Paper text:
The L-A virus contains a single 4.6 kb double-stranded RNA (dsRNA), encoding for a capsid protein (Gag), and the viral RNA-dependent RNA polymerase fusion protein (Gag/Pol).
The backbone was explicitly traceable; the α-helical pitch and β-strand separation were both discernable. Side chain densities were clearly visible, which allows us for the unambiguous placement of most side chains. The icosahedral protein shell has a triangulation number T = 1 organization, consisting of 60 structural units, with each unit comprising two chemically identical capsid proteins, formed by 120 protomers, with overall diameter (400 Å) and thickness (46 Å) comparable to its crystallographic counterpart. A similar opening diameter (18 Å) at the icosahedral fivefold axes was observed that is hypothesized to serve as a gate for the exit of viral mRNA and entry of nucleotide triphosphates. In the asymmetric unit, 26 side chains are involved in forming 11 distinct cation-π interaction networks, formed within monomeric and dimeric interfaces (examples are shown in Fig. 2c). Structural changes compared to the crystal structure are detected in both capsomere subunits, specifically in loop regions (R94–V104; Y528–K536, G601–H607) of protomers A and B, respectively. Specifically, the flexible region spanning residues 528–534 encircles the active site.
Numbering used by the authors:
A (entry chain A), C (entry chain A): 1 to 93, 105 to 527, 535 to 600, 608 to 651
B (entry chain B): 1 to 94, 104 to 527, 535 to 601, 608 to 651
Amino acid sequence: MLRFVTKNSQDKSSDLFSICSDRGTFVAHNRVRTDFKFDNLVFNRVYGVSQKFTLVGNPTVCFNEGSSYLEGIAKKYLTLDGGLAIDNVLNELASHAYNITSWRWYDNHVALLMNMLRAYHLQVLTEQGQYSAGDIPMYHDGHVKIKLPVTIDDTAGPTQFAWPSDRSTDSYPDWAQFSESFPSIDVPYLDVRPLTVTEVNFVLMMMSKWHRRTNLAIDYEAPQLADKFAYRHALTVQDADEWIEGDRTDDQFRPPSSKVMLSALRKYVNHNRLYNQFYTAAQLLAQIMMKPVPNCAEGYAWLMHDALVNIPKFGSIRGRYPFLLSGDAALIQATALEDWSAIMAKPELVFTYAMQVSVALNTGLYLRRVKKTGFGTTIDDSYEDGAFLQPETFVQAALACCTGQDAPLNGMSDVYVTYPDLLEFDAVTQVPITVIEPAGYNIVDDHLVVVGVPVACSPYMIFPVAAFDTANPYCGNFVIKAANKYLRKGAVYDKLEAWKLAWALRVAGYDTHFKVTKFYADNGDTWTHIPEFVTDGDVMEVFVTAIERRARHFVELPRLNSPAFFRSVEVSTTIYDTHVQAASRINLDYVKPVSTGIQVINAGELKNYWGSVRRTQQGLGVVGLT
Amino acid sequence: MLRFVTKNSQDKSSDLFSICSDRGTFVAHNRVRTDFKFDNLVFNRVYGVSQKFTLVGNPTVCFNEGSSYLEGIAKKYLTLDGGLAIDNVLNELRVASHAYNITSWRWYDNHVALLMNMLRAYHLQVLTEQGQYSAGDIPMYHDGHVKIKLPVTIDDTAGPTQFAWPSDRSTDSYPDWAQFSESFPSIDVPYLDVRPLTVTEVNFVLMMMSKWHRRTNLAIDYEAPQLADKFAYRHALTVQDADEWIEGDRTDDQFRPPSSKVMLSALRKYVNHNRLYNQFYTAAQLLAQIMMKPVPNCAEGYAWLMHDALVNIPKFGSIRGRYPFLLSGDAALIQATALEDWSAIMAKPELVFTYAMQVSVALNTGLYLRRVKKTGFGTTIDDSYEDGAFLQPETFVQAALACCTGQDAPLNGMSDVYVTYPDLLEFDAVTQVPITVIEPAGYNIVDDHLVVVGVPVACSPYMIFPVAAFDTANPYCGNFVIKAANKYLRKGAVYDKLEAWKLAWALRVAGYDTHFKVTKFYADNGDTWTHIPEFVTDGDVMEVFVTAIERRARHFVELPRLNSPAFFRSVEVSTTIYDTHVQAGASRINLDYVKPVSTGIQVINAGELKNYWGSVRRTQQGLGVVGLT
Amino acid sequence: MLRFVTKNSQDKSSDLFSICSDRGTFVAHNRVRTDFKFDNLVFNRVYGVSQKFTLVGNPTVCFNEGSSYLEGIAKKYLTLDGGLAIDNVLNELASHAYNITSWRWYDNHVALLMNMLRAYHLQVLTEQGQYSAGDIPMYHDGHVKIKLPVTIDDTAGPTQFAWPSDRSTDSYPDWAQFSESFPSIDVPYLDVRPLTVTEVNFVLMMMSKWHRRTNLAIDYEAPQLADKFAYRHALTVQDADEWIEGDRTDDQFRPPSSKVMLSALRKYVNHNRLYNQFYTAAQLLAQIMMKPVPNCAEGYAWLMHDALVNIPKFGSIRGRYPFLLSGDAALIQATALEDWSAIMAKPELVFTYAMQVSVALNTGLYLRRVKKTGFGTTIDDSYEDGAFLQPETFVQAALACCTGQDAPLNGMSDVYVTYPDLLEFDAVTQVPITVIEPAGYNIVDDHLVVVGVPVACSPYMIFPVAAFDTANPYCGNFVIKAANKYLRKGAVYDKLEAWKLAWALRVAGYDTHFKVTKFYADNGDTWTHIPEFVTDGDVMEVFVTAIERRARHFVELPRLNSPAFFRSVEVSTTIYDTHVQAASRINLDYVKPVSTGIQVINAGELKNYWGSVRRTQQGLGVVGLT
């Protein structure tokens, strides 16, 4: 994910942002200058654009077991594939020799790593002093009032990060202390030797069942990862045990700080060599993290829609034997290693990547819906069902169709964040609406309806996004061309050319009408949504009438509508300064990972989904890392 | 299937009609203009010709054992010649044999029955939401003379007006299902992968996995037991809404069957995910071939309508959700015809219904065509017509289609599947028709029962007009000339049988009925088509006498005395279609939307006739099964 | 046997059929079209032919020990030949070192595998709902009534598959549970670890003595395979023990279903790597399975004659040590492996191969008897005693002489299905006959007699059978040629030409007379038996008189008897559709076996009889696989 973020703008920028919330939402502000050069008369207008985001969500999570991955053990303990070298293990150690015939090796700690990630982010948020239940923004446009419900009330919601479980009200895993060389039960054991006492306590107690107490998307409900397990440690750690039996009071046993929690993460991962599984965990957390708050009224359907996540069941063989984590670690992906090094250099790469993936996902789904019609795209590709069926490649396909670069795959099989109710282009949403005054809006029975996925963000977190083959507002610059034909009342225009002209005029300060009435563009973002009527098929020409001016006008432009006054206006848009408000630039040359004691493979296996998906000219598809 | 409808791209386009039917039947209107060119000037008549089709049928189903096919499996485990690589799947299994003995031995992937069930449910729900789903009712034949009325197993008026679930709650058992996400299969049992389906679509799929109760007389509501006794589905979320409805927890109101769009999306998602293009192609072929029959406008024509078809739908088996990595990779040797036909159906679902309408007419006409072309109007001495394609039940419908129309009939693309009529293999097959008591006029009624030999023509060719059924010019060709009689005598105007029928048809269109000897030309008003009389087929005769040509009450374009010299003029007849519309109670398609998905799909145009990937071609020597080339 | 069945017709067909019975007999129907092209006038006649089969038989089985075969152990545990590598075993493990000097290694489980095969087929038959005692058909031809006796009466015979043994009325093997690494007694032990509890129970209890309770040929009597043994399993299984001591009632302890029985078969074979021994077991079961019901009256001598089977005594060393079944399995025949993969893909390959081998065996014996005389064959080969003396190559020699392809050998030494009373050409049979009306029949003292072996089937399960070098009805097509000389009353004809003419005329619908009176051909099969008088020597010419027509006549043909009207009639016969009635096509590309972890040898050793026998021009003989 490091390559994706560092390639959205340029290899030199590498701009990162920290987590911030304000009752569950935050706003990312920008400052952008737009040019207008025509007849060697360069004009410009500098303005600020704001795209706010919300961390409130209610994703659905299913905990279903999957494949077993052993890409962290020594070379001699692995065969030519991911399967362990059982003969080597036994020629090293009996009853176990006969027992092994009945010991499946299901080692997959992705659920644990994701749990630690969300707990760390929650603790960072509460030490930042703004952790709360989280509430959706209340959007009101003079004509329509909307307010999506949330389960947990913010005011009564907790302000401090409590432990996910309860006071012994629910059962807890039967943990144990392990120091021998003989695994006694096929139940998984962990190896937490480098961890300190408090880190081990946090790990074991958070293994227990998690309860959802806030509307935060990373606060989803999760059951206990394993009913029984043991940890291979030098000493027994039992402070959390005193807490469950009802001895340690809340004040002395509180969730550990962010620094120690991140340290426990680091120790766990780089002692068990879980770089691949942690990369998968970070990918899933980034894809589940947050959604943008829509400026337009109909964009709230994106907020109401809930993702579906498939986290594999927890299993471990690392702690079963102590020599497995020794030796030379094998089959570690270079992308996973570099991503791990970067995220432990700065732990907010996940946050900035999550915001970028949210914006890219929304725009990719919407542009798939639009480019189905034939707007901007030459080839009538199978956008509907091509690479969006594969749940693991769903969000990556959306990112590829939006941005055009190689979206990083989950790196793990049978894990995905998927919107099942979004593959169809007929899917509707009933957003609650208390209409203030009647206007142009498809308001039927107190809820307007939307078709497919709407726009809820603006392509400003990722600006140079190459959505279309030709120049467009999504691209850096475009040239407004002559109309197809001019008439008395106006001129006809192609779908894309008309939208480009309307966008440029809205930035300049002109309101643009059309027939077969307004090009919508909300203030505070000044990005013109694609018109609903032109979105559908059978419409190839747009009649532009009445290019009127607005109350506030910035750049004064020719008519471009009358043949006499049309001029080849060439525009150009560049983003200058961004600052979230509820930098931190990274340096690749200082975060390079540890190549020693690690065997690194550049390529991956398509079964395990170690690759990327790129929007080819002939159609987007999955490709190998090679 | 698409190429057959488009007649191999008639101006790169064709036309389709959606399914619509009232009381189990629907008319199929037409408007044509028939010319008459004599004395170097042209007369014409514009008349509306209709055709009645019925969805009612009672085919005999046979869910017997069938072969397995692994076409939608990744390219690295299948192979064109090396076939299934069991070494590769054992390696990628993650000892090996310890998994072999459990489940890795069967390899019985076949979902044809499930796809057919989903398709018929889609059709039934379409009829339901169009306000036209009801119990079937075969029309009656009122003609003043002998009248025919047939019974129905379920009464129409008491018949249900709403498509409820096929199975009946609290009467029969259901397959035992439970979500399964384990990498390692545990029990040898069909595992079907439904991961990307929504809750309602996966619910609909697993509910249609159950057994099917017939609640109507329609031909696509045939009985079907539960496809698998036990099974498990690969899905992230455990779905039990169907299970709740199995018990009393969920009521009938809250588990109504979904809309047609939801079932269509479920079918699209299933076939796209599992790469079931060929299997769905076979399912669509079978369902269309059993869809419907044309209601005759003649008396002896109902004998064809009495017959019931026998279908070989293979027993269900799914090995695609056992291993997640089976579908990871481009599909193996998917037929190009299957891909294009799948894209066409998903774009326009009415293609299956239109192809069914075309196939019913083509088959009913081609059975008559073969019963005649075997003897060649009785001037063929030996048995060197090679009609043996009619023998094996699989190429029955295909051979009938190829014999009726010169186009290559599409093979079923699957082995041990067919739609066949066992008792009509031989052309000397007698059938009895229950008949009401009315005085006769030469309908050879025996014991108050029409005795019918062979198979009768029951439909007009107006939906496939360029049929080219016969070699010579004729009404089937559309344009023909009427020549002078061979020689004139007292009885009058010796005519060859085929030319006599051509003259009779043209005169009946023009408003003159004709009298023959060795007596008239009983035809239909609504459908001014005159079906070929038995003197053409019998082959005992080679010349026929036309005694008098009289004027009907409904006179039309005026002609001279054709059956006499010094008065006959060589009129010529040409007809063109003005407007066709299938009403009851259209959607243009061109070859622009045919473009199939070729991203990550290995496509082979060639096929092997062992698996029935070809097309039967009619030549002058006879029929012949030809591969896909 | 897969190559034989798939080569009888063509590599593409591969047609298989399931087991079905109707009071012990079933009928296989066909639909065949016969052509008659002459003077460019192609005529044809389509008709159905039915050849019924019977599963009732009383074979004689002798349980005599033979060679010890060790072609399933690892490479290091075997020497350059089948003998085990005793030095390698001992340098792996003592008293055993001294004990071994007195441990013969007799490992041969063919009797066990055959017992499981017959039990599985019986359970399939009873779950099909038609299992019974089985009764021979009662054939009656208006002139003669015959009904062969059977020991068990069908009506009182059991309808459900009971366990072969009794209620502790007979003694049972003293089984034991083994888990150590030390074999305590030279008594054999088995290794049944992958088997479940019920599969182990079925295996051990069916090891006990088998009792014949029905007239079925696969229900032959067999004693207990071993008085003592032990099974190497994780746990003791004793439900069948409770059954023998008289505790578990019949209802809870019933014979396992077909699926679990086949699963036990699969587990046993592919864990002990008994592919060769199982191939031998399937061969023997196929050769013993069934016989055809004869349409002609004198053909019932084939029914009365009983085969002789030599099953080796049961012995096992697989369960003695647990490491033997590990490693790389050695010396596995490719034919055996592919046959095993096919039969576990579909378990009815054995049934279809058994029906084919029955038809081929009868026709091969009869054609050996006929071709002794000189009918059709040029060389007076030693058909009487050449390759029919070797009991193991008896049935294979019959198949080779019939069909002409390579009959698959038993793949095991000192095992055979042999008819000792059939090598002579003078062997007679006294079939019981209640004669209805006197006619042409050699009826002496209430029993007609037959000489040698008669025809009891028709070559329709295997049609393209190349019995003779020249064209014939057994071949696809033949041309009726001009007579040697024409006389006033008729024309003379060679033996084979006269029989070809008579067969063609009977298919057409003409009855053919001859002198030095009728060419017999029964309806429902319309295949003309070779005339008895022309069968013997010293007769080279046949006088054909009076080619009269029949009651039902299909194809109208020239006289072919008078020189004026003789025409070069060319016939052609093809089979279109078959359907047994008391398909299932196989696909070779999907049933390919597991080549990994198995060492496969194409060639075999003539001592062990790993080969095939082909009818060469100069004479049939055994050849190697090479």
